[PDB]
Amino acid sequence: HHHHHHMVHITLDRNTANSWLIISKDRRQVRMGDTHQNVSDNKERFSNYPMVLGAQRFSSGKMYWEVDVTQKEAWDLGVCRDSVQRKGQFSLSPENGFWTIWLWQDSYEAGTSPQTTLHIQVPPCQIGIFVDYEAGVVSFYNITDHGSLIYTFSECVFAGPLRPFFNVGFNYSGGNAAPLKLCPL
Ligand SMILES: CC(=O)N1C[C@H]2CC[C@@H]1c1ccccc12
């Protein structure tokens, strides 16, 4: 890929975060806490899962950012509609307004319905996410493997503004406490 030059400065939106998440002062890192984080509930917060949105909203153009996933056992990354459901149980699918990939139990999968197996030779420590609003494209790149393509969603029906989407995953095992981190330009 040569997509680096549509780089956008993403920050996390505290108000959308699950109440157990801890967002750094610079709003560039998020991790699971060991308890509820002493914040009020609001209609924006994801209730059931350790999810948060980016502050940025996109309705046009080309956007690129990178996320560090070092030493995590489980995570979800991509983009979603601003209008996605926040409360209760739901699946990550384009029909529900999500364009995502994940790591779960040593397998990488794209969030189609049903989910699609990914073929990654070099487990990634850093993921690049590229959105072309007009083209209807969301692509994922393996930064650890010289930017090799992971997966492309095409003919996407965004149907409104998009937000960067993050899930740090649960930490039942004790091996998934590490943060997601937005990487510098
Ligand atoms: C009581 C309850 O249902 N939970 C507590 C904890 C672990 C599972 C679930 C949950 C969802 C989101 C964030 C934190 C949690």
Distance CA 81, CA 52 (A): 13
Residue span of the structural domain in which 106 resides: 4-182
The response to whether residue 90 sits with its C-beta less than 6 Å from ligand 1 reads no
Nearest CA, atom 7, ligand 1: 170
Name residue, tokens 């959105």: 131
Nearest CA, atom 10, ligand 1: 48
Distance 137 CA to ligand 1 centre (A): 33
SS (H, E, C) 99-144: EEEEEECCEEEECCCCCEECCCCCCCCEEEEEEECCCCEEEEEEHH
To 10 degrees, the CA torsion angle through 34, 40, 43, 46? Answer: -10
Phi-psi region of 146 (alpha: psi -120 to 50; beta: other; left: phi over 0): left
Length of the chain: 185
Site to substitute for ligand 1 among 20, 22, 39, 90, most atoms within 8 A of C-beta: 20
Structural contact between residues 18 and 166, judged by C-beta atoms closer than 8 angstroms: no
**How far apart, in Å, are the Cα atoms of 8 and each of 45, 68, 93, 126, 184?**
24, 16, 25, 16, 10
Tokens of 21: 């998440």
What's the one-letter identity of residue 19? Answer: S
Domain count for the chain: 1
Structural contact between residues 77 and 100, judged by C-beta atoms closer than 8 angstroms: yes
Structural contact between residues 92 and 75, judged by C-beta atoms closer than 8 angstroms: no
Handedness of CA 59, 40, 96, 10 (dihedral sign): positive
Say which DSSP state 25 is in: T
Burial 126-161 (b: 16+ CB within 10 A, else e): bbbbbbbbeeebbbbbbbbbeeeebbebeebebeee
Nearest CA to 128 out of 178, 78, 70, 73 is that of 78
Nearest CA, atom 1, ligand 1: 48
Site to substitute for ligand 1 among 39, 41, 48, most atoms within 8 A of C-beta: 48
SS (H, E, C) 142-181: EHHHCCEEEEEECCCCCCCCEEEEEECCCCCCCCCCCCEE
Which atom of ligand 1 is found nearest the CA of 47? 12
> How big is the CA angle at 75 (ends 72 and 78), to the nearest 5 degrees?
135
Handedness of CA 53, 170, 71, 99 (dihedral sign): negative
The response to whether residue 50 sits with its C-beta less than 6 Å from ligand 1 reads yes
The response to whether residue 18 sits with its C-beta less than 6 Å from ligand 1 reads yes
Q: Which domain CATH number covers 81?
A: 2.60.120.920
